[PDB]
Amino acid sequence: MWQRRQRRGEERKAPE
Ligand SMILES: CC(=O)Nc1ccc(-c2cc(CN3CCOCC3)c3ccc(C#N)cc3n2)cc1
Numbered sequence: 001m002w003q004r005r006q007r008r009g010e011e012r013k014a015p016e
Pocket residue numbers: 001002003004005012013014015016
């Protein structure tokens with residue numbers, strides 16, 4: 001998958 005951390009504000013950054 002991809003583009004999941006975008007909803008949070010990181011786009012695609014490490015887990016937490
Ligand atoms: C506190 C808090 O929310 N913490 C947290 C935990 C996990 C993530 C997270 C989620 C996804 C994607 N999902 C895709 C479906 O199966 C599970 C993972 C990611 C996908 C790609 C990348 C990269 N490079 C990082 C990701 N990071 C971001 C933040």
